[PDB]
Amino acid sequence: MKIDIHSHILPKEWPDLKKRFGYGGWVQLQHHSKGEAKLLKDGKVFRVVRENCWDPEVRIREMDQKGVTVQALSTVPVMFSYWAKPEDTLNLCQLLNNDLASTVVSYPRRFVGLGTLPMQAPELAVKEMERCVKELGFPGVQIGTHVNEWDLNAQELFPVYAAAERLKCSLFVHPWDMQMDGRMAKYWLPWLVGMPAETTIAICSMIMGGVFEKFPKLKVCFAHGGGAFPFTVGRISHGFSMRPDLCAQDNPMNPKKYLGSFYTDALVHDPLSLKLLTDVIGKDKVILGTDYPFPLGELEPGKLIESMEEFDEETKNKLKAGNALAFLGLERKQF
């Protein structure tokens, strides 16, 4: 109920991507009733959204009612498009980042922007990142948990982390491209189980890949409370100790040593989970995030935090806004 690090927004409209690039697989936003729209992917309706998914005016009103001071605006992860031709993804990114920035310019005290990057093309990614930071004023970017067959340990991605560290660009890591078919095509498993699993993999990949070691000043936040990591860290740490031949060939330090090296959002829904999150990740490293405006998010921003008997007000203020400011490298004076 001050800062929302984890919220998604789309332009109200964008050009026909298949016409523009010449191949399909892209997503389009289709208005059909008033206040509602459908996301389509070359046939099937992928998702139904309301006006709050694109109209900043609608958003600030809801934000006012819920006590949210500022949302960090990122695109919807389906937009990542890491699978496409590198310049076409770059072309979509620039469209999406410009749209984000234009929203931010309209309400500089209610919004910051987290840009998207053509991660399948590292040199291109680095330059769009410099542009988001130097030109658009963005404090960071949102990237997926993996880039095609690259997990975040991939040395192909090291130029991206280097630039991010140098530019002081923060990385919000969002799970995407879970298995959607086969056994996972029931009970909403890719969102309920697959995303937390993606995030756990990403965390393990950066730790055991040495990313945090090689880039000690890189600021990273993971979505949904780090997925399963705060609970399974015991297993992950014990395994690493037991088979260094399988786990330690890239980075010899136990994953335990990295607790306190990264942030997670606070989006875990239940009080017992939130308490464990802060016990493992640290009261300084957990950031209120909401998945606004999506149903699987916290419908009442900061309300779980507000209800925690155990948290003193200093702690609650950290989770609500303080940690987000530190993660984004911003000062209170702006909001």
Question: Which residues ranging from 286 to 305 are in contact with Zn ion (CB under 5 A)?
Answer: 291
- Contact set for its own copies, span 38-57 (CB under 8 A): 40, 42-45, 48
Q: Is 223 in the site for its own copies (CB under 8 A)?
A: no
- Specify the residue, 76 or 101, whose C-beta has the smaller distance to Zn ion: 76
Determine if 168 is a binding residue for its own copies (CB under 8 A): no
List phi, psi (to 5°) of 90: -60, -45
User: Total residues at the site for its own copies (CB under 8 A)?
Assistant: 79
**244: β partners:** none
Q: What is the DSSP string of 235-268?
A: HHHHHHHH-HHHHSSS--S-GGGGTTSSEEE---
To the nearest whole angstrom, how small is the minimum distance from the Cβ of residue 78 to its own copies? 16
Torsion of Cα atoms, 163 then 140 then 138 then 67, to 10°: -170
**Considering only residues 228, 281, 305, 324, which one is a binding residue for its own copies as defined by CB under 8 A?**
228
Q: How far apart are alpha carbons 193 and 187 in whole angstroms? A: 10
Is 180 a residue that touches its own copies (CB under 8 A)? no
Token pair 């756990």 is at which residue? 200
Q: Are 56 and 106 in contact (CB under 8 A)?
A: yes
Per-residue binding letters, 103-132, with its own copies (x by CB under 8 A): --xx-x------------------------
Type of residue at 233: V
99 binds Zn ion (CB under 5 A): no
Of 158 and 294, the one with the shorter C-beta distance to Zn ion is: 294
Cα separation values, 175 from 37, 52, 99, 179, 293, Å = 24, 22, 23, 11, 17
Token pair belonging to 114 = 């987290």
AA identity, residue 287 = I
Interface pattern 62-101 for its own copies (x via CB under 8 A) = --------------------------------x---xx-x
Out of 183, 216, 217, 331, the only residue in the binding site for its own copies (CB under 8 A) is: 183
Minimal distance, residue 81 CB to its own copies, in Å: 19
Read off the amino acid at residue 169. Answer: C
- Binding part of the chain for its own copies, among 65-73, 76-84, 161-169, 202-210 by CB under 8 A, reads 202-210
Q: How far is the CB of 258 from its own copies (least distance, A)?
A: 14
Q: Is 140 helix (H, G, I), strand (E, B) or coil?
A: strand
Q: Which residues contact Zn ion (rule: CB under 5 A)?
A: 291
